[PDB]
C-alpha cells in the first residue's frame, strides 16, 4: 500500500514525467498492483522496471480513455530514450485502454497481445509509431514478449469460457472458472488463485469481508471477540490498525465519525458510539480568556459543549448590555446552551441572572466543578446578589473538586440550607463555605420551601423529587421514585446502585416475580420468543458467521436453539 507518484499495491496513479538519463528506479522493482493508471511521458531513461506488476485496475484513466499511457519518451538530439517496458507479469487491465505511441526507441510493443491484457472490450488500444530496428523475441516467448529475453515474455491467460462463468475463468471448461470474488481472470478455482481482488484480501485469499471483530462463540451462546479480527485498511486486511489510525468497528478510518467517540478499552483506540451527544471542550470566560463575561457575542459559541476548559463568568454587563451600546443584551432563552455542559475545569461565577428565571436549571446536567482555576479569593462557585433565584437547580452536581463556595445576598434563595456539602465538596470542608445573608432559614421552613419528603438526609437543589441529592429509595430519569417496576407495570425494570433500569426486550413481564436481574438478555425469568442457549432472542441465528462460517438451528420444540 503506497500513494501515487517499496510496497506492493499502488493506491493512486503511477506518473513518471520528464526524467534524466539515469534514475534509481530500482525502488519500483516491487510493485504488484496499480489502482489507477500508468503515466510514462517525455522520459529519457532506457527501462521502466515493473516486473511484478500483474494488475493495473484503472478506476480512473488518463486522457479519459487510457489505463496505460506512454508517449514521447525520446529526444530529438540525445541518444537517451525508452527502449524496454519491463512489464513481464502484466496480466490484466480491469478498466481502461492502452496508449503506446511516439516512442522512437521502444521495441517489442507491436508483438504484445493487448486484447488478453485489456479486459474492457470497448476500451481503445493504440500502439503504433514506436521502435523500428527491433530484434525478434526469444524462441521461448513464442512471438509475444516485452524484451529480448527468456523471462520477458507476455503470459497469456484470457480464454473464452462457458456461460456458467461470465468472463471470469481459467479455461474453456466450465469446471475451471474463477471465484465470485475475482475481479477478472484467475489461475485456479480456489479463492487463493486470483489475479486481482474484487474487494479485500486476507493474505492472498480474496474475501468480500475481512474477519469480523465480533464472531459467534460455540461456548457461550452469544458473541465474542474473534482471534483474527482483521480490519479493513482499504484493500488489505490487517489485524492491527496502522499508525494513528483509529479502529472504526470494521474499518481502519483516519478519524472517528461525528456520531462516535474515540474510546480505548482493550488497548487500541476504537470508535464507539457517543450515545447522545459527543464530548466537546470549549473556551470559557475569566482570567486567561478573551472576555470578562459571557454575553450576546459569546453565547453562540457554547453549542454542544460538554466540557469547559476554563470558567464561566456571568456579569450584569453581559446580561443587561454593554455600557457603550456596542453589544446588545443577552436573550435569556439562549442561556439554554449550557444544558450540554457537564464539567467545568475552573470556576462558576453567577453575579447576574434573568429576573424571570428563578433558578439555574440551565446547568441541570452540570456534573463536576474542578476548581483548577479559582475566582476572587479562591472561589470555585460564586453566586452573589441574585434577588430572583429561588433555588439553585444543580441537580446533577455531585462534585466540587476544590476551592471555596460563596453564596450570599440572594435574599430569595432556599432549599440549600439542608444541603450536606461534604457529600459534594471534596476535601475537608474546614472554612470553605461562605453561605450567609440569603433567605432566612425560618422563612423557608414557614412557607414550606424545603426538600421533598422523598429526599434523603443529604439535601436538595430545589422543590420536587427531581432536585434531590440522594433518593431514599430509587431514582428514575433523575427523579426519586419509591418503587421500580419490579413486579408490575411497563416496562418491567430492575435495580442497580439505587437506580431504575428497563429489562432487556424479548423478556415477557413476569407477574408476581422479578422479570430481569441485569441489563443484558442473559438475565431473565423466561423468554418472550426464542432462547438460544442462556439467552433470549427474538429470532434464532438466521445467518450469522462464527469462527468457521454461517450458524443456524431450528427452534427445538420448546423454543431452544
Amino acid at each position: 500500500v503506497c500513494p501515487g507518484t517499496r510496497c506492493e499495491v499502488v493506491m493512486g496513479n503511477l506518473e513518471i514525467v520528464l526524467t534524466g538519463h539515469n534514475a534509481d528506479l530500482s525502488f519500483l522493482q516491487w510493485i504488484r498492483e496499480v489502482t489507477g493508471y500508468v503515466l510514462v511521458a517525455m522520459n529519457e531513461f532506457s527501462t521502466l522496471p515493473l516486473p511484478n506488476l500483474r494488475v493495473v485496475r484503472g478506476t480512473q484513466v488518463y486522457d479519459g480513455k487510457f489505463a496505460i499511457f506512454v508517449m514521447l519518451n525520446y529526444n530529438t538530439n540525445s541518444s537517451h530514450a525508452l527502449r524496454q517496458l519491463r512489464l513481464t507479469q502484466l496480466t490484466e487491465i480491469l478498466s481502461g485502454g492502452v496508449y503506446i505511441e511516439k516512442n522512437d526507441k521502444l521495441c517489442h510493443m507491436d508483438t504484445i497481445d493487448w486484447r488478453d491484457i485489456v479486459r474492457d472490450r470497448d476500451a481503445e488500444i493504440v500502439v503504433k509509431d514506436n521502435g523500428r530496428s527491433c530484434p525478434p523475441c526469444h524462441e521461448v516467448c513464442k512471438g509475444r514478449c516485452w524484451g529480448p529475453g527468456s523471462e520477458d515474455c507476455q503470459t497469456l491467460t484470457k480464454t473464452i469460457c462457458a456461460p456458467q462463468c461470465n468472463g471470469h475463468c481459467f479455461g474453456p471448461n466450465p469446471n475451471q472458472c474463477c471465484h465470485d470474488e475475482c475481479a477478472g481472470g484467475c489461475s485456479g478455482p480456489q479463492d487463493t488463485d486470483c489475479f486481482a481482488c474484487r474487494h479485500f484480501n486476507d493474505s492472498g485469499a480474496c474475501v468480500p469481508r475481512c474477519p469480523q471483530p465480533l464472531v459467534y462463540n460455540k461456548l457461550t451462546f452469544q458473541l465474542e471477540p474473534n482471534p483474527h479480527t482483521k480490519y479493513q485498511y482499504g484493500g488489505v486486511c490487517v489485524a492491527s490498525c496502522p499508525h494513528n489510525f483509529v479502529v472504526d468497528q470494521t474499518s481502519c478510518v483516519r478519524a472517528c465519525p461525528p456520531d462516535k467517540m474515540e474510546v480505548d478499552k482493550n488497548g487500541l483506540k476504537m470508535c464507539e458510539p457517543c450515545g447522545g451527544l459527543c464530548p466537546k471542550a470549549c473556551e470559557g470566560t475569566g482570567s486567561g480568556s478573551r472576555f470578562q463575561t459571557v454575553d450576546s457575542s459569546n453565547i453562540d459559541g457554547f453549542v454542544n459543549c460538554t466540557k469547559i476548559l476554563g470558567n464561566l463568568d456571568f456579569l450584569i454587563t453581559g446580561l443587561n448590555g454593554d455600557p457603550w451600546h456596542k453589544i446588545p443584551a443577552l436573550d435569556p432563552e439562549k442561556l439554554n446552551v449550557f444544558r450540554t455542559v457537564r464539567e467545568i475545569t475552573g470556576y462558576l461565577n453567577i453575579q447576574s441572572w434573568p429576573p424571570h428565571m428563578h433558578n439555574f436549571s440551565v446547568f441541570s446536567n452540570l456534573t463536576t466543578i474542578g476548581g483548577r482555576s479559582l475566582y476572587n479569593r479562591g472561589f470555585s462557585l460564586l453566586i452573589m446578589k441574585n434577588l430572583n433565584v429561588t433555588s439553585l437547580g444543580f441537580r446533577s452536581l455531585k462534585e466540587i473538586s476544590a476551592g471555596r463556595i460563596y453564596i450570599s445576598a440572594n435574599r430569595q434563595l432556599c432549599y440549600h440550607h439542608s444541603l450536606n456539602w461534604t457529600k459534594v465538596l471534596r476535601g475537608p470542608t474546614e472554612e470553605r463555605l461562605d453561605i450567609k445573608h440569603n433567605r432566612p432559614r425560618r422563612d423557608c421552613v414557614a412557607e414550606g420551601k424545603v426538600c421533598d419528603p422523598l429526599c434523603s438526609s443529604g439535601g436538595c437543589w430545589g422543590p420536587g423529587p427531581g432536585q434531590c441529592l440522594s433518593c431514599r429509595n430509587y431514582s428514575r430519569g433523575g427523579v426519586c421514585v419509591t418503587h421500580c417496576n419490579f413486579l408490575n407495570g411497563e416496562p418491567r425494570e430492575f435495580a442497580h446502585e439505587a437506580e431504575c433500569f428497563s429489562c432487556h426486550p424479548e423478556c415477557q413481564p413476569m407477574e408476581g416475580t422479578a422479570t430481569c436481574n441485569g441489563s443484558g438478555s442473559d438475565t431473565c425469568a423466561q423468554c418472550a420468543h426464542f432462547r438460544d442457549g442462556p439467552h433470549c432472542v427474538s429470532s434464532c441465528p438466521h445467518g450469522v458467521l462464527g469462527a468457521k462460517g454461517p450458524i443456524y438451528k431450528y427452534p427445538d420444540v420448546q423454543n431452544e436453539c
Partner: antibody, heavy 118, light 110 residues
Framework: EVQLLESGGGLVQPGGSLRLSCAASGFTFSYYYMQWVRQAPGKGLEWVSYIGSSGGVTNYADSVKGRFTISRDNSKNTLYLQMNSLRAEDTAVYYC???????????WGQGTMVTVSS | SVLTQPPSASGTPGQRVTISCSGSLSNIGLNYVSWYQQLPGTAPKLLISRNNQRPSGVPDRFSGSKSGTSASLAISGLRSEDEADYYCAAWDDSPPGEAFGGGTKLTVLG
C-alpha cells in the same frame, strides 16, 4: 520570588521509606493543584501524582499506587510525598510542579535526587 | 496513559524542524497541550502552554499547535542552544492524571 523549593531526597535502600518536601513561595499555594513528576536517569518524564487545592482529589500512577501518598499543608505552604516501600525502579529525580492557567506546569522544583540501591 | 512523540529529531543551524505529539480523546482531545524543554543537566521548564501560548522568554521561533487528538511543536530557525529534550504533556480525564510524552531528543548538527 516565585519558587518551588524541594527537599528530602537522598540515598536509600529497597524497602526503605522517604518523605519529600516542597516549600512554596512567591505565590498563593492554596489556590493551585500540585504535581509530582519523577525522571529516572535515562528515562523520560513520568507523572507520579497530584492533589487538589483543598487537598481533595488525589490520584496516583499505577507504578506507585499504594506505596506513595501525596499530601499538602496549605498553612505551611508545603507539598509532601510519602514514599513507602521504595523499589529499585523508584530511583529518579523527583520534581514538584504547580498547575497553572490551562493546567500547564509553569513552575518546577530544582530536582532533589532520590536513589534506591541495595 | 502516555502521549506519542518521535524519539529523535535533527536539523542544521537555521532549519525548521517539527515535533508531532499523538494522543487520545481522553487526554489531548479534551485538554490543553503543553510543551516542556529540558536542557542537558537542567530541570525542564515551560516552553509552550495552552496549545500555543509562549511565556515571556520563549522566542517567536517556537510555535505549538493542536488539531483533534494530536499536537505539534514547530521550531523555525534552529540554533545550537535548542539542543535539548522536548516533552509534550496533557491532562487526562478517564484515567485522572497527566499524560506525558516519551520524549524527543533534538540534535543540532552544524
Amino acid at each position: 520570588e516565585v519558587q518551588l523549593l524541594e527537599s528530602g531526597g537522598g540515598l536509600v535502600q529497597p524497602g526503605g521509606s522517604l518523605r519529600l518536601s516542597c516549600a512554596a513561595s512567591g505565590f498563593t499555594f492554596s489556590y493551585y493543584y500540585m504535581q509530582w513528576v519523577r525522571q529516572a536517569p535515562g528515562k523520560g518524564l513520568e507523572w507520579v501524582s497530584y492533589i487538589g487545592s483543598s487537598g481533595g482529589v488525589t490520584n496516583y500512577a499505577d507504578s506507585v499506587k499504594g506505596r506513595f501518598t501525596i499530601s499538602r499543608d496549605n498553612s505551611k505552604n508545603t507539598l509532601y510525598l510519602q514514599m513507602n516501600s521504595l523499589r529499585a525502579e523508584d530511583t529518579a529525580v523527583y520534581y514538584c510542579a504547580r498547575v497553572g492557567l490551562g493546567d500547564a506546569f509553569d513552575i518546577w522544583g530544582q530536582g532533589t535526587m532520590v536513589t534506591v540501591s541495595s | 496513559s502516555v502521549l506519542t512523540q518521535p524519539p529523535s529529531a535533527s536539523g542544521t543551524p537555521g532549519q525548521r524542524v517539527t515535533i508531532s505529539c499523538s494522543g487520545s480523546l481522553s487526554n489531548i482531545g479534551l485538554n490543553y497541550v503543553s510543551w516542556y524543554q529540558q536542557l542537558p543537566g537542567t530541570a525542564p521548564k515551560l516552553l509552550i502552554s495552552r496549545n500555543n501560548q509562549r511565556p515571556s522568554g520563549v522566542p517567536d521561533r517556537f510555535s505549538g499547535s493542536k488539531s483533534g487528538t494530536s499536537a505539534s511543536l514547530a521550531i523555525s530557525g534552529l540554533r545550537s542552544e535548542d539542543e535539548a529534550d522536548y516533552y509534550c504533556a496533557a491532562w487526562d480525564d478517564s484515567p485522572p492524571g497527566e499524560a506525558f510524552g516519551g520524549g524527543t531528543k533534538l540534535t543540532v548538527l552544524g
